[PDB]
Amino acid sequence: GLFGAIAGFIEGGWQGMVDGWYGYHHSNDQGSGYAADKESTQKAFDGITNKVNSVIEKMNTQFEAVGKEFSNLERRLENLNKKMEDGFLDVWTYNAELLVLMENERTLDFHDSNVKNLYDKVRMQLRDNVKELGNGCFEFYHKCDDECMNSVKNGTYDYPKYEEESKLNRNE
Amino acid sequence: GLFGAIAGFIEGGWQGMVDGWYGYHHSNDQGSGYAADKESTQKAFDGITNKVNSVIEKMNTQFEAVGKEFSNLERRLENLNKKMEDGFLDVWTYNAELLVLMENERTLDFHDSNVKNLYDKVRMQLRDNVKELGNGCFEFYHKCDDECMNSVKNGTYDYPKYEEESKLNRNE
Amino acid sequence: GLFGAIAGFIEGGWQGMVDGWYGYHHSNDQGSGYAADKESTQKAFDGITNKVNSVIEKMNTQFEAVGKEFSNLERRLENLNKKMEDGFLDVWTYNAELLVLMENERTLDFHDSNVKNLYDKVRMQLRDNVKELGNGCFEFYHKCDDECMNSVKNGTYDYPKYEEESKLNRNE
Amino acid sequence: PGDQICIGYHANNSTEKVDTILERNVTVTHAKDILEKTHNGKLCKLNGIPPLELGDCSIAGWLLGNPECDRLLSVPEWSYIMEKENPRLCYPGSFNDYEELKYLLSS
Amino acid sequence: NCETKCQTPLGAINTTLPFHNVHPLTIGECPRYVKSEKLVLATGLRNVP
């Protein structure tokens, strides 16, 4: 999209992840599998629900009674009432449709930004210990495990631990 | 702009490219020249035409007849008709002007995103085989040619082929 | 936010900078301290003032007189006038509130983009002479000073000068 | 091989389409319709109070006591008034400010 | 026998959403009548296999 993640350098989506909106896929010696990112997903969910609550709850109520109420003695006042009804109809139709379009564009871009941001958060942490594959994956220049993967996911990853091993395997 | 490409780290535009909206410029031993990116340009064109078709085609028709139709016997009903006309006039004027502003801002940012995304697509593919000049160019640490340039442009570039030559010329 | 700078990989804001909206913090042998970026800040200020001037100055004037003007002989025309008033009230209320929300979202994202863009401008200039800490800082692999810091800030930084010293301290 | 960790996004079997300012007919994982399209055919009461149901009768015939109109209702209070197509006054004539009266008695 | 805040000749409506396309003639606290056949907001993300 706008941030080039969804349908971008990350081609497809993951059917296997029912846990959340954005998550990880790890593939190591122990075993592969998916896992969500609760923080980013819940933040998005809170914002999105706050969005649809905004376009719904901010609408004014106003009890009114739409009808003819004007006889054939007064066809000018009928026409006046008709101009008014249609005038608002044209206003609300046009405004509502464009609102939905613009808001949907923003929403999709919003999701894109979220995935991209998670990608950057990860890459910024891993640095040159991994080979950036460009498809959304990182191939480790060392041997990571389930104990190391969780360290990446939870925000505490030890770069200098794997620095020298990664360097040697990098210039291999 | 928002993504910092147009009028950003890429200072100017290319008069020499009439082929499309975004493209490449290669400078090698064979010869220099410009070339467009049909995919990105056509995608943008389809979206943009879909945009102006949205703000135009989504407008409601409604046959009406604007006029006085009220004598001097009824100056209150005249004033009513006038309040209504002006009321909608103020609504449509304000809404239309802000619509155009907001939509133009989005459009320029949209283009910016497209150029930036193409830049990232390229850089992600080339990796450290090139020196990122920061002006939107990449200086090769090896000798690329028209046969190699086309490989970069069409999405299939051979990094490990030029890995060792680039490394040596990099630490030169 | 959308570009992940504010409340993102750059966690907090700087109380110590009263000079502008976005700036630098340098910490070296001479001494620490803050400094603004006049270019980026003033650009933002010009755009922002142009924004609030847009939503204010683009509103139509139109002298009108709101009132009853209809007796109890005509309660249908009263109700007509009431439908009209409320109709516009609902239109202006809804449109104004959503306008403010959408515009505020854009503004915050706009600021985010500006900080991120300054970060990228800096990182693109410094290259591998520094260790990207990920919190918004860059730790030099060499010894920079007030004379060198100003070179970074003003857009003219000498990479090849510090290339070899940085490399050696990098593989330390 | 090598050891990997990847960043990805949710995907499902949802076939819901939406339109944007840029693209149309875009499939999404989930969506919400903000348009009320339901016509259940029911006629309820309004904010707690029932409507006055005249049926074939008309406000003129009802008040005057048209012999062709059944009083049967006699409700002390109502929210709106419901009728039918076409009225059917016994003694021909006219009703002055009839519309104003219908509006007055609408609730 | 039922309660509704908005009443139309074709029936009653739930009044929760801001827009309806049911019927122009209306009585009550009602959503805005529009000519639209569908107004669908995207909540989730783009669906890609």
From TrEMBL, chain D:
Q: Which domain of life is it from?
A: Viruses
Q: Which cysteines are joined by disulfide bonds?
A: 57-69
PTM note says: In natural infection, inactive HA is matured into HA1 and HA2 outside the cell by one or more trypsin-like, arginine-specific endoprotease secreted by the bronchial epithelial cells. One identified protease that may be involved in this process is secreted in lungs by club cells. Palmitoylated.
Question: What family does this chain come from, according to its entry?
Answer: Belongs to the influenza viruses hemagglutinin family.
Function as written in the Swiss-Prot or TrEMBL entry = Binds to sialic acid-containing receptors on the cell surface, bringing about the attachment of the virus particle to the cell. This attachment induces virion internalization of about two third of the virus particles through clathrin-dependent endocytosis and about one third through a clathrin- and caveolin-independent pathway. Plays a major role in the determination of host range restriction and virulence. Class I viral fusion protein.
Which proteins does it associate with, and in what oligomeric form?
Homotrimer of disulfide-linked HA1-HA2.
Q: What is this protein called?
A: Hemagglutinin
Q: Write down the species.
A: Influenza A virus
Q: What is the lineage of its organism?
A: Viruses, Riboviria, Orthornavirae, Negarnaviricota, Polyploviricotina
Automatic annotation (TrEMBL), chain E:
Post-translational modification note: In natural infection, inactive HA is matured into HA1 and HA2 outside the cell by one or more trypsin-like, arginine-specific endoprotease secreted by the bronchial epithelial cells. One identified protease that may be involved in this process is secreted in lungs by club cells. Palmitoylated.
Q: Which cysteines are joined by disulfide bonds?
A: 6-30
- The superkingdom of the source organism is Viruses
Subcellular localization is given as:
Host apical cell membrane; Virion membrane
Q: How does it assemble?
A: Homotrimer of disulfide-linked HA1-HA2.
**What this chain does, per the record?**
Binds to sialic acid-containing receptors on the cell surface, bringing about the attachment of the virus particle to the cell. This attachment induces virion internalization of about two third of the virus particles through clathrin-dependent endocytosis and about one third through a clathrin- and caveolin-independent pathway. Plays a major role in the determination of host range restriction and virulence. Class I viral fusion protein.
Give the UniProt family note: Belongs to the influenza viruses hemagglutinin family.
Query: Know the name of this protein?
Result: Hemagglutinin
Which organism is the protein's source? Answer: Influenza A virus (A/Japan/305+/1957(H2N2))
